[PDB]
Amino acid sequence: ESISLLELCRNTNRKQAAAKFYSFLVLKKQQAIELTQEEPYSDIIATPGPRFHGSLEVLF
Amino acid sequence: GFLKLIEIENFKSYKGRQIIGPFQRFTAIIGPNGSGKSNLMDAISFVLGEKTSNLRVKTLRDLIHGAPVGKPAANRAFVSMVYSEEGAEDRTFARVIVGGSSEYKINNKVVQLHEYSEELEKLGILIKARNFLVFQGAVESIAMKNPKERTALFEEISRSGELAQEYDKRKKERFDRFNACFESVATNIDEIYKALSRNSSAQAFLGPENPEEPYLDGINYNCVAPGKRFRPMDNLSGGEKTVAALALLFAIHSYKPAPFFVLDEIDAALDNTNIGKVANYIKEQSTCNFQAIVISLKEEFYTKAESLIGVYPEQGDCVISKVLTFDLTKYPDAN
Domains of chain A: 3-59 (1.10.10.580)
Give this entry's resolution in angstroms.
2.1
Instruction: Specify the experimental method.
Output: X-ray
Give, in degrees to the nearest 5, the angle at Cα B154 between B153 and B155: 95
Question: What CA–CA distance (Å, rounded) separates B93 from A2?
Answer: 39
How far does A59 lie from chain B, in Å, by closest CA? Answer: 18
Q: Does B30 touch chain A (CB under 8 A)?
A: yes
**Virtual CA dihedral for B64, B67, B72, B73, nearest 10 degrees?**
-40
- B63, B74 contact by CB (below 8 A): no
Question: What CA–CA distance (Å, rounded) separates B206 from B247?
Answer: 11
Distance spanning both ends of chain B, measured CA to CA: 33
Structural domains of chain B, with CATH: 1-132+260-335 (3.40.50.300), 140-257 (3.40.50.300)
What is the distance of C-alpha B301 from the center of its chain?
16
- Count the Cβ atoms, other than its own, within 10 Å of residue B325: 22
- B85, B91 contact by CB (below 8 A): yes
- Bridge partner list, B262: B133, B293
Question: What CA–CA distance (Å, rounded) separates B275 from B196?
Answer: 10
Question: What CA–CA distance (Å, rounded) separates B123 from B131?
Answer: 12
How far does A11 lie from chain B, in Å, by closest CA? Answer: 8
Q: Which of A29, A31, A45, A51 to probe by mutation at the B interface, max B CB count within 10 Å?
A: A29
Verify whether the Cβ–Cβ distance B22 to A28 is below 8 Å.
no
Strands across the sheet containing B219-224: B203-208, B219-224, B231-232
* Dihedral over Cα of B244, B245, B250, B255: its sign: positive
Which amino acid would we find at residue B106? Answer: I
**Of residues B249, B309, B35, the one with CA closest to residue A18:** B309
Q: Does B6 touch chain A (CB under 8 A)?
A: no
Phi-psi map region of B285: left, alpha, beta (phi>0 left; psi -120 to 50 alpha): alpha
Q: What is the CA radius of gyration of chain A?
A: 11
Question: What CA–CA distance (Å, rounded) separates B309 from B292?
Answer: 13
- Count the Cβ atoms, other than its own, within 10 Å of residue B168: 8
| Chain A neighbors of B333, CB-CB under 8 A | 13-14
